[PDB]
Amino acid sequence: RENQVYSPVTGARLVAGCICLTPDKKQVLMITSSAHKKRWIVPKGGVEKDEPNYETTAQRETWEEAGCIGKIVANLGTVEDMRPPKDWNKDIKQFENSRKDSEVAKHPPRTEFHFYELEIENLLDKFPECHKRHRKLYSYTEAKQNLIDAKRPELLEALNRSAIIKD
Ligand SMILES: O=C(N[C@@H]1[C@@H](OP(=O)(O)O)[C@H](OP(=O)(O)O)[C@H](OP(=O)(O)O)[C@H](OP(=O)(O)O)[C@H]1OP(=O)(O)O)C(F)(F)P(=O)(O)O
C-alpha cells in the first residue's frame, strides 16, 4: 500500500531501524529476511505518513519484526542502499572507471535508512511476525559475517557506528 514516505530530493524510500544491543553490549539482535529465509538482517521498515519522527518508525518496526522492547540510547545517523536498479543486469553501460579506481554507474539510492541504538529491556515470545521470521542474538563477528552473507554492507556500517564491543 503506497502509504510510504520518500526523500523529496533523491526519491529514495525513507526507512528507520534499530541496532538493538544487550546491556553488556556484547551482542546485537538480528531477524531473518521474510523473502530470503536464511538471510540475517536487523529490524527496519518504511516510515509512514502519520509518524512524527524516525524514532517512532524505528521502535514500531523493532516490535513488529523482532518482539523487542527497549530505550533508544543513540542516533546512528543515516546509511543508504546504493544497490543498482533491477534493469542494470543487462544494460550497455554498467560501470564508470578512473585511472586509479573503478565504480558502479551513478544512480539514486533505493533506500535512505535512519538507525538508532536501542538497549534491549525485554524480548517477548509473541509479536506480529512471530511465525513469519526468526530472531536471535549474535556477537559482533557473527553479525558482521551475517550482514556480508546477506549482502547488506550499509546495515554493517550502521552496526559499526554502534557501541557494540568488537573485541
Ligand atoms: O525487496 C526489497 N526490499 C524489501 C525488503 O527486503 P530486505 O530489506 O530484507 O532485503 C523487506 O525487508 P524484509 O521483508 O526482509 O524485512 C521490506 O523492506 P523494509 O522492511 O525495510 O521496508 C520490503 O518492504 P515491504 O514489503 O513494504 O515491507 C522491501 O520491499 P518494498 O518495501 O516493498 O520495496 C528490495 F530492496 F527491492 P530487494 O533489493 O531486496 O529486492
* CATH number of the structural domain spanning residue 35: 3.90.79.10
SS3 content of the chain, % helix, strand, coil (to 5): 20, 35, 40
Query: Which amino acid residue places its CA nearest to atom 21 of ligand 1?
Result: 45
CA–CA separation, 131 vs 75, rounded Å? 30
Residue 2, domain member (yes or no): no
Q: Work out whether the CA dihedral 82, 19, 134, 40 comes out positive or negative.
A: positive
* Residue 91 in domain: no
* Residue 160 dihedral angles phi and psi, to the nearest 5°: -65, -30
- Residue 23 C-alpha cell reads as 546491556
Binding site per annotation, positions:
13, 33-34, 44, 61, 65, 81, 83, 110, 133, 152, 154
Does residue 166 lie in a domain region?
no
**What's phi and psi for 138, nearest 5 deg?**
-140, 145
- Mutate which of 29, 33, 54 for ligand 1? The one with the most ligand atoms within 8 Å of its CB, which is 33
Residue type, 34: S
Give the total number of structural domains in the chain.
1
Q: How was this structure determined?
A: X-ray
Does a structural domain hold residue 137? Answer: yes
Annotated resolution, angstroms: 2.1
Choose among 150, 163, 167: nearest CA to 44. 150
